[PDB]
């Protein structure tokens, strides 16, 4: 079971928030990366995330944004005075809402949609993370076809909620003021790419950057191109003022 982390490192600190459906795996090696170069790192959890499938079609955006507040006060309430926030996926659409929330020294998105789909869609993805994640409990392939039909005895009403939150701050762009570094895998297939000009060209921001990534896919931190991710996040929060 994966768990939150916290790595100690120097005096700023940096949030990172992970995918719908994903948990804090999707960036321990971005944040111990950071760790080895100075930067205090904490990745929270969102709630029915890093547990059974079961669980997360009872939760909805309204939690996972505690989950993300929280983790912010979790770095603030140890000392730590200056924090950046770096996101994955939904993770980087509620870095975006994170700074316009509260202060925040610099703001990195990775493969944020700022377009939606539809709710059967969107289910349809919720249905192959359950199979993908009880392929490797180790069920057998008609065990996990009996949990599958009665996994879809229940809706997921949060979806709703979930696309509305994207438009939400899609909408909310130009109160963003905090330098923005836009990170895109050009051949992203689980969102519309050109989500990045969106966030790109909306906020306020005097410091944008932008970079498109050419050989990976929408889970960028764990593609092969992560090393080179890596070392352009660590040149974009030293140049901050901190």
């Not at 192959?128 to 069920?139: I, L, Q, S, T, V």
């Not at 909310?172 to 051949?187: C, E, G, K, N, S």
Request: glycine letters at 8%; aromatic letters at 12%; charged letters at 25%.
């Amino acid at each position: 079971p994966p768990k939150p982390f916290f790595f100690e490192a120097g005096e700023r600190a940096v949030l990172l928030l992970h995918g719908f459906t994903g948990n804090s795996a999707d960036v321990r090696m971005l944040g111990r990366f950071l760790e080895s170069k100075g930067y205090t790192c904490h990745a929270p959890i969102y709630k029915g995330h890093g547990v059974p499938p079961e669980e997360l079609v009872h939760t909805g955006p309204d939690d996972w944004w505690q989950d993300v507040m929280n983790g912010y006060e979790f770095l603030k309430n140890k000392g730590y005075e200056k924090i950046a926030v770096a996101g994955l996926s939904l993770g980087g659409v509620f870095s975006l809402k994170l700074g316009y929330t509260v202060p925040i020294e610099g703001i990195v998105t990775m493969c944020a949609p700022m377009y939606i789909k539809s709710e059967e869609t969107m289910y349809e993805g919720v249905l192959e993370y359950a199979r993908e994640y009880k392929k490797r409990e180790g069920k057998s392939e008609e065990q996990i076809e009996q949990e599958m039909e009665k996994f879809k005895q229940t809706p997921m009403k949060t979806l709703k909620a979930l696309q509305e939150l994207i438009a939400d701050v899609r909408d909310h762009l130009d109160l963003i003021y905090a330098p923005t570094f836009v990170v895109q895998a050009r051949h992203d297939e689980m969102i519309n790419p050109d989500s990045a000009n969106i966030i790109y060209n909306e906020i306020e921001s005097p410091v944008k950057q932008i970079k498109w990534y050419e050989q990976s896919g929408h889970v960028i931190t764990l593609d092969q191109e992560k090393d080179q991710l890596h070392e352009d996040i660590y040149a974009f929060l030293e140049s901050l003022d901190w």
